[PDB]
Design a protein around this ligand. Sequence first.
Ligand code: JQH
Ligand code: JQH
Ligand code: K
Ligand code: K
Ligand code: K
Ligand code: K
Ligand code: MN
Ligand code: MN
Lengths: 500, 500
Amino acid sequence: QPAHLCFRSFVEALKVDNDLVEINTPIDPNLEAAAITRRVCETNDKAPLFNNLIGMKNGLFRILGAPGSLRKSSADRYGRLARHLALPPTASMREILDKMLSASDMPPIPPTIVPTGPCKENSLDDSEFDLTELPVPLIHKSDGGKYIQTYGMHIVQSPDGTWTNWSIARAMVHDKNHLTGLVIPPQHIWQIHQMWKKEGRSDVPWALAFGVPPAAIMASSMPIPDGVTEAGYVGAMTGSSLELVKCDTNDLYVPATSEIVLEGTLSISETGPEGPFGEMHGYIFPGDTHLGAKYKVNRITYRNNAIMPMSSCGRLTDETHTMIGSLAAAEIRKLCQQNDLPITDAFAPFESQVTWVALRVDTEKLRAMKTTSEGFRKRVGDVVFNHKAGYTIHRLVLVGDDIDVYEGKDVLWAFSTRCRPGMDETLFEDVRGFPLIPYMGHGNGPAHRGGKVVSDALMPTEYTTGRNWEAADFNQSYPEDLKQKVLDNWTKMGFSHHHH
Amino acid sequence: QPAHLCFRSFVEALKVDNDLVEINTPIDPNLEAAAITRRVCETNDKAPLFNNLIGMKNGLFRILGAPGSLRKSSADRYGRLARHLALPPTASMREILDKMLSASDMPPIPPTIVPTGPCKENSLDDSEFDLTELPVPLIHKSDGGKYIQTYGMHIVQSPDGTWTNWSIARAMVHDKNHLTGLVIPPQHIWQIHQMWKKEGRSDVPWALAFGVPPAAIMASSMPIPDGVTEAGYVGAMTGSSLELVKCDTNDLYVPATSEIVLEGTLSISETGPEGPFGEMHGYIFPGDTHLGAKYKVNRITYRNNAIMPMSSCGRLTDETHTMIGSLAAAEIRKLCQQNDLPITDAFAPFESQVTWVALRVDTEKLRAMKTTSEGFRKRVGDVVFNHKAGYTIHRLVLVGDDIDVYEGKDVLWAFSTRCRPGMDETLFEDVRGFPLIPYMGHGNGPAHRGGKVVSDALMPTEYTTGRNWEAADFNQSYPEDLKQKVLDNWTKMGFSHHHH
Ligand SMILES: Cc1cc2c3c(c1C)C(C)(C)C[C@H]1C=C(c4ccccc4)[C@]4(C(=O)NC(=O)N=C4N2C[C@H](O)[C@H](O)[C@H](O)COP(=O)(O)O)N31
Ligand SMILES: Cc1cc2c3c(c1C)C(C)(C)C[C@H]1C=C(c4ccccc4)[C@]4(C(=O)NC(=O)N=C4N2C[C@H](O)[C@H](O)[C@H](O)COP(=O)(O)O)N31
Ligand SMILES: [K+]
Ligand SMILES: [K+]
Ligand SMILES: [K+]
Ligand SMILES: [K+]
Ligand SMILES: [Mn+2]
Ligand SMILES: [Mn+2]
C-alpha cells in the first residue's frame, strides 16, 4: 500500500529515506522515549522508532516519534510532510499547502467500506485490556497523565449521520477503561459533542484510530469547513477512495490499516481531571489540572506489531508547529481569497511559535481597491478572527509581494521595519481568543477573548502608486552583471552545496 | 602597536586570525568593492581588503570592508569586535558590552599629545587634492553620492573647549573640497553644531579621521553620556592614554596612527544635497535627497599605503547592527540600572533589525518592588524613551531571568508567547522617534515623534510569587540523569563540534 495511504508503509518510507533510527534495545515509555523524541525535534534529527518499549505486551505497542517534524537539510526540510501526501521529498511548503487545499474545490470522494483489514488482526474486549497496563508514555515530567493520544484521529459523527469528523485532540489515560481529553470550542469534536448533548439521549459513539493513513492525519490536523467529512476531502485530495472497516462495537468506520483502534463513547455528562500537558507554545504549568471530557473505551483492535505514533511537543520544532500552524495558515489563505481579499500566500512563522500568520498581499490588486491601512486591516481581521480557521492565530502580519512568507527572517524584517507599533495596527478584543497561549490562559486578561491584532507591514505607497524603495541587499542594490561577476569570482578571490 | 590601538595592526590581526581576504587584482570602487563586502556581510565571510582599488593614486587609498561584521562560526562569532578591544576572539557579547561599559565608573584617562605619527607621512593641501578624483565608493546602486565616510570618526569640540566628541555619522562627497552628511538631533555632533550656531561667529573646526584605533571607533559608535570626551573614556577602557597629534590647519587632535585625516570645517550656515543612502534598516528610497550638513575640507594627511575602512550597510549583518544596536543596548542596560530598575542584561536582537531591545529582568528584585505590569512598563519606557540612548529603539521587550537576551530565538519565543498584544503593552507617542526606520520617515505618521512601545513579556506571577511554569523543552521537561543518559547514548543509538 502507498505510504500516504498506510502508516506501516509510511514508516518504511522513512527508513528508505534514511530518515529513521530504529531502536531495538529497551526504552522506557516513562519519559525516555519522549526525551529522545524531544531531542530529535529540537535538532531536526531522524525520526525514532522504539521497537522495544518497556511494558509492551501482546503486541501493544511500539512507538514512532516525530512523525511530522523537520529534517536537517534545507533541500528536504519538509520531507516528512511530503511523505504524508505522495509528494516528492523536496516539496516546498507552498506545494504541501496547495496539496492540502486542493480538495476544497473538488467533489468529495466518499470512502469505500471493506469487510476487514489489518486493524482487525488482534482484539481485546472489555475483560482483556487495561489502559494503565499498556506502555503509554509520560511525555513531559510534569504532565498530569500519560498521554496515549497525541497523533491519532478521533472519529465522531453528527446525530443525524450527515457529518463524520476526523481530528486530532489530546487525551490521557484516566483509568483502566477511560481517557480524559481536550474538547473545546470551536473545534469540530466539540461542535459535534454539543449536538449530542442537546439531543440528550446518549453518549457519543466514538472511535480513536492511531497510525492512520498519513494523508488522513494531515486532514485531521487542518480546519477544513464545518460540516465537511474529512474522509471525502482526503479521498478527493489523494484521488482515491479511502478504505474503511466498521468498528466491532459501534457503527463508525475506521481506516482499514489503522495500527490501533479504540472503540467506545465520549460522555455527554461526565468529566475528569485532564492536563496539565507540555504544549505547542513551549510550556507546562505544573499542577494546572482542569476538567476535561471523558471517554470510555469498550474495545481495542490492532495490527500485529502495532506502532503508536507520538508527538513529543513543546519548543520548536514538532507537529504542533509544522502541521497546526501551517495547515491553519493554508485555510486562512483560502478564506481570505474567498472573501475577495488580495492574499496570495499565508504561513505561520515558526519564530512566532505559530501564533502569527503572515499574509502576502498582491499589491497590484490592493492598489485597485483604493483603500487605506485602517480600512484594510479591519477587513482582514474581521474575516480571519471571526472564523474558526483564525482561532489559533493572535497576530496577522500583512506584507507586500517582495516578502516570502515562508521565510521567517524576511517576515521578521518586514514586521520590524514596515509596521509602526500602534498606528499601523488594529487590536481586536471582541473575538475568540486561544487560551493555550500562556499570555491568554495564564495571562492578565480574559482567557477566551481578545488579545488579537492585525499588524500592517505594507508601506504607504503600496496602497497608492507602488513600492518606492529598493532593498539594501546584495540582490537589489547591485546590477545583474556585477552580481554575476562577484559570484563567478567568489572562490577565485578566496571566499567560501544545495543537497547537503 | 597593539591591534586595539592601531588600525594597521588590527588589519594584521584579521590576517593572522584567518579572517581576511586580500584582493590584489583591480577592483572598482563604483559598486564592486561594496558588492563584495555586502556578500561578505550577508554570509558572515572573511573581511575583504582591496589592495588594488581602481582610481587609487599617490597612496589614496585601499579599502577594508566589513571591519565589525560577524564570523561564520559560533565560537568566535564576535571575534572582529573582540579584536577592537584586546579581548579573546571567543569573547561573548556580554563580555564585549561589559568592556564597553567598564569606563563608565572609572576616572577618564586623558590623551597624550605627541609631536608626530604615521598619519603625517603624507599630506595634500587645498591645491593638491580633489575629493571627486579619489576612489571613493558608490556603496549601493541608488545612493545619492559616493559615501567616503562610513567608518571614520568625526571630531568636533564645544566652543568652550571642554568637550571633544568622537562619533560616526555618514558623509558623501559634494564636490572637490566638500562633503555633505547627516547631522541630526539628538546626536552629539548635532548638539555641538548647535552650540557653534548659537555663538554665531564661525564654522565649526572639524576633523574626520579614518582608520582610527579600533577601541576608539567602538566608542565613536556608542551613546556615552552628554559632555563626556570619548578619548578619555577609551583611555580608561583600555587602561592606556591614547596618543594624539595636532591637526595642521586647526587645533583639534587626531589619533597618531589614523590612516587618513581630513581637516576643515562643518558649516553653521550652508547645506547641500545628502542621501539617499542604503541604510541600517535594509532600505534605500531612491531619489529621496534631503539637505544635509556641509563640510569643507582644507587638508588631507595620510599614512603610506593608507587603508579606508568601509561599511557596506543594509540587510543583516553589518556594523550598523553589531555596533549600533549592541552598543545602544549596553548603554540602555546601564541607564536602567542607574534609574533603580532591576535590569541585568540588554541586547538589540538582529531579527528586529536592531529596532528592539530585550531587557532581562532580575525577577527576585521585581517581586520586591510589589508593582504591576502597567506601572513597570511605564517606568521603563519613560526612562529609556526619554533618553538619547533609547533614540534608535522603538520596542522594548521585558523578559524574565530564564531568557538569554543575546539569543534572538529565545527573545522571539518569549515575546510571542508571554506578551498579550495591546493589554501587555504601553504605546509612547510623545517621545522622539527615529526617522530612519521606514515606518517612521516613510510611514503613516510623524517622522520624528512616537511609534514606540514597551512590550511586557513578563508573566503575571513573575511580579508576585515567582515563575509558575516549566518549559516543554529537553532541558526542563526531563530529569538530569535521564537527559545525561540520552546524550551519552545519542550516537550509539544512531543519531547525529563547538569550534567548527
Ligand atoms: C497536529 C496536532 C494537532 C492538535 C493537537 C496536537 C497535535 C500533534 C497535540 C500534540 C495532541 C497537541 C494538542 C494541542 C491542541 C490544540 C488545541 C486547540 C487548538 C489548536 C491546538 C490539540 C488538542 O489537544 N485539541 C485540539 O482541539 N486541537 C489540537 N490539535 C489541533 C487540531 O487537530 C486542529 O485544530 C484541527 O483543525 C481540528 O480538526 P477540526 O475540528 O477542524 O475537524 N492537540
Ligand atoms: C557604526 C555606525 C554608526 C552610525 C552610522 C554608521 C555606522 C557604520 C553608517 C554606516 C555610516 C550608517 C549611518 C546611520 C546612522 C544613524 C543615524 C542615527 C542614529 C543611528 C544611526 C549614522 C549616521 O549617519 N548618523 C548618526 O547620527 N549616527 C550614525 N551612526 C550611529 C552613531 O555612531 C551612534 O549613534 C553614536 O552613539 C553617535 O555618537 P555620539 O553622538 O553619542 O557621540 N551612521
Ligand atoms: K480536521
Ligand atoms: K505600515
Ligand atoms: K560616541
Ligand atoms: K505579559
Ligand atoms: Mn473537521
Ligand atoms: Mn559622544
